[PDB]
Design brief:
The structure is cut from a larger assembly and holds seven protein chains of seven kinds.
Chain B lengths: L1 H8 L5 E2 L3 E2 L40 H9 L25 H19 L3 H8 L7 E4 L10 E4 L2 H19 L7 H14 L5 H16 L1
Antiparallel strand pairs in B: 1-2, 3-4
Helix pairs in contact in B: 2-3, 2-5, 3-6, 4-6, 5-6, 5-7
Chain D lengths: L8 H14 L8 H4 L13 H17 L5 H6 L4 E2 L7 E2 L4 H5 L1 H8 L2 E2 L7 E2 L1 H20 L2
Antiparallel strand pairs in D: 1-2, 3-4
Helix pairs in contact in D: 1-3, 1-7
Chain G lengths: L7 E2 L5 E2 L4 H6 L7 H10 L12 H12 L1 H4 L9 E3 L3 E3 L4 H18 L4 H6 L26
Antiparallel strand pairs in G: 1-2, 3-4
The chains are: A alpha+beta, B mainly alpha, C alpha+beta, D mainly alpha, E alpha+beta, F mainly alpha, G mainly alpha.
Chain D binds one RNA strand through α1, α2, α3, α4 and α5.
RNA sequence: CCUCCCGCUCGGGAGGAGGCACUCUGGGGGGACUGCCGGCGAUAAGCCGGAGGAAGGGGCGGGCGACGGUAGGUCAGUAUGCCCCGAAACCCCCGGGCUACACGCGCGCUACAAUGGGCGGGACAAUGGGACCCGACCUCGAAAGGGGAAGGGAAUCCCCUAAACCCGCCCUCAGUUCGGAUCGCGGGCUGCAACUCGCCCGCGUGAAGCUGGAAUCCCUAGUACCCGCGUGUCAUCAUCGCGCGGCGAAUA
């Protein structure tokens, strides 16, 4: 068989993925892909897996562990890594360029994540000032 | 819950929100073709960051554009499952997360009556809710005019979707029109150009006041 | 029930422990934990007045004492902050604070 | 061919809560829904399901965790209390529905207290579950 | 022999690394088996403070860092092979803890 | 006349009036309790010798 | 169903609506929304159905769980007033007992000459602090208890 | 390899051996510089557009604020010229006052419901703080809390549960099951002591408010908008100040 370990990181959901051959396993943090309640962020994970095909999804075991705060955050870290897990597998430029033309959230993360809350002039949030009315 | 999972087998294949094929519709006008993300795929939430570039906001999934101009109204106050709200408004004093549900149930409530691919009723409601002419109180050379200004396909879309999203919250106001409904009964009647769309009443008036002034 | 409690007399004979089940959470606490060394010199001047050595007119800065059944009858002089304001203590005053009855402000109209 | 891992938590909970009516060892005591309930409830419900869900969770949670305490399961529910116009804050549930529940499971032989100081599953609590999940995961492939 | 832990922290970056490196160099060659100098966290300490003593207008607010870094070292040597290695000069300002177990 | 000593003798078990600094000798003004009891104003003057860093 | 009515009379002659049983009793002063669902149990009814679907026989089971609730069950912190005026163990409160018991204790304090009774006469919260400018722009709390 | 469960015997999951791969931790090194390509520009400076690429043309966010001035602000933090007090404008003490209110405004929180409420279930973080201090876990108590007690001066233990989310169920738009003021009572907790003047828990009580004139403020992207989370100071008053991550735009 094989072991190709990859990563996928979006807004600090770090997905730890492994792609070995088998029988159609989809593991997320220990639980099948079935346990999630929002239908929505599931479909996001599902986007790459059809762009390539069910053929390669069925023939390969994917276990990922996404330690990330967001529900959509987890999903997004799962969308970037499967796509990178499937481009290392087959090896061709056909599956890589087909992802890039569709969206760059499969193969690029961000350049940025979050900004600090500025000291500010005694109010709440990074970018805000106390209200004025002294004119 | 079982239909819900069929809604997970079906978007896979590929279709928006679980059961709307993105090929059902076409953009017949060559004006609204590059300005609309009908053609690309699956999820609005995306977080693909826009306004990054000059037109980093044209490539925005039509529905995502819907979600956050449908999310708009919002201050200060605090929401959680507790006792707890409003804080997420008559238009998300809060997130695109519980916004995306409203637009999904409004695609469900507009499909239930019309029975068409609802992405053929909304893309038929954002080519009609946009006025074709606008007057700006524009002065140039120190000389105050109120003038013929024609509208650009990007600034069209925006006035289409925003006037759709502004009309519904006057009606949903402390009323049985739920936004999942009040939006679904705005999107049908902006598609039709009906005399019941607070969004096709400004479209017209903004062209008609602007014709007088020209 | 006229007169607060079982009867005015039976609550002078139940003092430590048995009153407690009747009282508020707040009155219990200050009896049960105890009160300060100025509250110990005020148990001589209620006792000089009921019997014996020449009685002083009882004065107090005690505004944290909650009225008991034995102290019902005496005319208690509670310093409002400037001067001593009198209170003839009743059996309907069992269970209230002593600093309620004397004022914490002069009482006039606002304007 | 199933664990509590393989079944969604919306289909697992009415299948274990029924299997807590049926067996029929765990039951509602009368004092626990009446007025000894968890924090504040907009209404108090007169449900068997109410008791059978607060326990159907307890057999899933001790599976995942080792030393799962009373102070953990009181704080694990999710729910608040008003202070006023001051915004709400995070408080914990009623320890009465959690300290009788573990002990109704403890007499049933589903949970046991370990000698390290804590709460773990027995084999009888672990098999009661894997059978109920083998029935749920089998039904989830039949149903489009 | 006696497995000793040298747990060595310092308030600044330059002072902590020189000692950690020197401890792994001198111990290397004698009657010592030594496990490598492992870096644990910086419990960066934030003191977040009001500048202005008026507390008036806009007051610009100082962010403070105290960063304290902790290297850890297991070693298999005697109590006599330990002092030989604890000879070293050490920056001001570098805490060196010693636990002793068999 | 004659009387016994005084250097204050009332309760000051806890609060701000319990504290004083080791540089400007105050009760109500700031007392940073990390084992560095000073006011906020001293703190600013003292820190570069402490080894705190301005940079965020 | 158990014989439709739109107005059955419960708790004396005061009226039971067609909203829901748990909300129809809340109105009847003395029975709230938590105390309504404590007397649905003892009596043996479905709590979530409409009010007015009651024969004559259900209306008698509620009026005797009200007169003395501390006889049927109802814990000694889950009953309306526990430990009353220093010598009643527990009682019930209803539109006539609640109105009288609260004006009595207020009649008691004014004679006592306290800082609670005259603070309920001038127009003020006693422990809520600010009277500084709240109830602002001519406004008013309405103190206790009803401006509907 | 080994212990436990389940099974359609194909196969799913946990523990410990075992293994440092991965995440991560903190120390060091490379990578972006208009380098290249086109257009505009005096072939210069520079601006625009393009390709390759994780990232681009101040990459992005902070700290970093000259000579001075408003006689701005503070001698009520300290330092200090001058003046004034001297059983006092000192000193000690208890109690009361700063928390008084017919009202006016500023800055904010909470809020006028179906994008909703109850109930249940399930999937998810980060900064931090923790010795008369964080407190596992076990027990009693409806709960607030009390009794017992492990670990921890810290990547190794504890606060700790994130919240928003979603799925099913009950409920079916009224000043209400909204909203929580006000008042009665029962009860805990700290301190000598919470009436004046603390917070929470339970039952009863259940006020204004059903989208707000003139006028006016804040901000330009991982930002605003939104959701919780921690810390400071610290017994206790936080709808505050500082700071963290989760969802994630409009227009320019």
């Amino acid at each position: 068989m094989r072991i190709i370990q990859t990563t996928g990181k979006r807004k600090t959901a770090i997905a730890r993925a492994v792609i070995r051959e088998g029988k159609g396993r989809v593991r997320i943090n220990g639980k099948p892909v079935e346990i999630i309640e929002p239908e929505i962020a599931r479909f996001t994970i599902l986007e790459p897996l059809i762009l390539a095909g069910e053929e390669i999804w069925n023939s390969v075991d994917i276990d990922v562990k996404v330690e990330g705060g967001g529900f959509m955050g987890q999903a997004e870290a799962a969308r970037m890594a499967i796509a990178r897990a499937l481009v290392e597998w087959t090896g061709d430029m056909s599956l890589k360029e087909k992802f890039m033309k569709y969206d760059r959230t499969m193969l690029v993360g961000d350049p940025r994540r979050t900004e600090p809350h500025k000291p500010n002039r005694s109010t709440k949030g990074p970018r805000a000032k106390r209200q004025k009315s002294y004119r | 819950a079982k239909p819900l999972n069929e809604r997970f087998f079906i978007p896979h294949e590929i279709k928006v929100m679980g059961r709307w094929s993105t090929e059902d519709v076409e953009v017949r006008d060559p004006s609204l073709k590059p300005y609309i993300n009908l053609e690309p795929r699956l999820l609005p939430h995306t977080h693909g960051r826009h306004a990054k570039k000059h037109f980093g906001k044209a490539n925005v999934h039509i529905v995502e554009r819907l979600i956050n101009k449908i999310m708009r109204s919002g201050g200060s106050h605090y929401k959680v499952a507790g006792h707890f709200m409003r804080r997420e408004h008559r238009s998300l004093n809060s997130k695109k997360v519980k916004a995306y549900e409203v637009v999904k149930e409004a695609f469900k409530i507009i499909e239930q009556r019309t029975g068409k691919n609802p992405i053929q009723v909304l893309v038929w409601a954002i080519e009609n809710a946009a006025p074709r002419e606008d007057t700006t109180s524009v002065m140039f050379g120190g000389i105050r005019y109120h003038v013929a200004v024609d509208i650009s396909p990007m600034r069209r879309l925006d006035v289409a979707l925003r006037n759709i999203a502004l009309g519904a919250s006057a009606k949903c106001y402390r009323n049985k029109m739920s936004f999942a409904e009040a939006l679904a009964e705005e999107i049908i009647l902006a598609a039709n150009k009906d005399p019941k769309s607070y969004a096709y009443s400004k479209k017209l008036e903004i062209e008609r006041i602007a014709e007088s002034s020209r | 029930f006229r007169y607060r409690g079982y009867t005015l007399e039976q609550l002078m004979n139940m003092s430590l422990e048995e009153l407690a089940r009747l009282f508020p959470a707040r009155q219990r606490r200050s009896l049960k934990r105890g009160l300060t060394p100025e509250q110990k010199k005020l148990l001589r001047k209620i006792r000089l007045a009921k019997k014996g050595k020449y009685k002083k007119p009882i004065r107090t800065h005690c505004r944290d004492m909650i009225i008991l059944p034995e102290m019902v009858g005496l005319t208690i002089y509670v310093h409002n902050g400037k001067e001593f304001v009198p209170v003839e203590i009743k059996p309907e005053m069992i269970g209230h604070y002593l600093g309620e009855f004397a004022p914490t402000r002069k009482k006039v109209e606002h304007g | 061919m199933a664990t509590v891992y393989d079944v969604p938590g919306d289909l697992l909970v009415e299948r274990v809560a029924q299997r807590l009516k049926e067996i029929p060892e765990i039951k509602p005591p009368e004092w626990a829904p009446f007025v000894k309930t968890g924090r504040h409830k907009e209404r108090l419900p007169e449900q068997e399901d109410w008791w059978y869900y607060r326990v159907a969770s307890i057999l899933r949670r001790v599976y995942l965790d080792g030393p799962v305490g009373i102070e953990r399961l009181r704080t694990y529910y999710g729910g608040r209390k008003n202070r006023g116009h001051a915004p709400e804050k995070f408080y914990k549930a009623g320890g009465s529905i959690i300290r009788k529940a573990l002990q109704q499971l403890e007499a049933a032989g589903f949970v046991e207290k370990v000698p390290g100081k804590g709460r773990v599953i027995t084999p009888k609590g672990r098999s009661f579950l894997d059978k109920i999940a083998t029935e749920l995961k089998k039904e989830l492939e039949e149903i489009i | 022999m006696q497995k000793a832990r040298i747990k060595i922290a310092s308030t600044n970056v330059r002072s902590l690394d020189e000692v950690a490196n020197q401890i792994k160099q001198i111990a290397e060659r004698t009657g010592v088996r030594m496990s490598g100098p492992i870096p644990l966290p910086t419990k960066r300490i934030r003191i977040t403070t009001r500048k202005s003593p008026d507390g008036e207008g806009s007051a610009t607010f100082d962010r403070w860092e105290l960063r304290v870094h902790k290297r850890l070292i297991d070693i298999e040597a005697d109590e006599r092979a330990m002092r030989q290695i604890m000879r070293i000069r050490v920056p001001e300002d570098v805490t060196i803890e010693i636990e002793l177990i068999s | 006349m004659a009387k016994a000593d005084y250097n204050k003798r009332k309760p000051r078990k806890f609060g701000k009036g319990a504290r004083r600094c080791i540089r400007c000798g105050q009760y109500g003004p700031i007392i940073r309790i990390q084992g560095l009891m000073l006011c906020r104003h001293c703190f600013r003057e003292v820190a570069p010798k402490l080894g705190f860093r301005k940079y965020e | 169903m158990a014989n439709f009515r739109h107005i059955v009379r419960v708790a004396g002659v005061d009226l039971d609506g067609n909203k829901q049983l748990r909300w129809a009793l809340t109105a009847i002063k003395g029975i709230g929304i938590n105390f309504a669902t404590m007397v649905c149990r003892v009596a043996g009814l479905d709590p979530f159905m409409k009010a007015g679907y009651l024969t004559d026989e259900q209306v008698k089971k509620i009026e005797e769980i009200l007169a003395d609730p501390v006889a049927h069950g109802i814990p000694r912190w889950a009953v309306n007033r526990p430990k009353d005026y220093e010598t009643g163990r527990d009682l019930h409160l209803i539109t006539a007992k609640l109105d009288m018991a609260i004006r009595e204790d207020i009649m008691r304090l004014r004679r006592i000459r306290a800082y609670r009774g005259i603070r309920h006469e001038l127009g003020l919260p006693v422990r809520g602090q600010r009277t500084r400018s709240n109830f602002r722009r001519g406004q008013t709390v309405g103190v206790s208890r009803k401006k509907k």
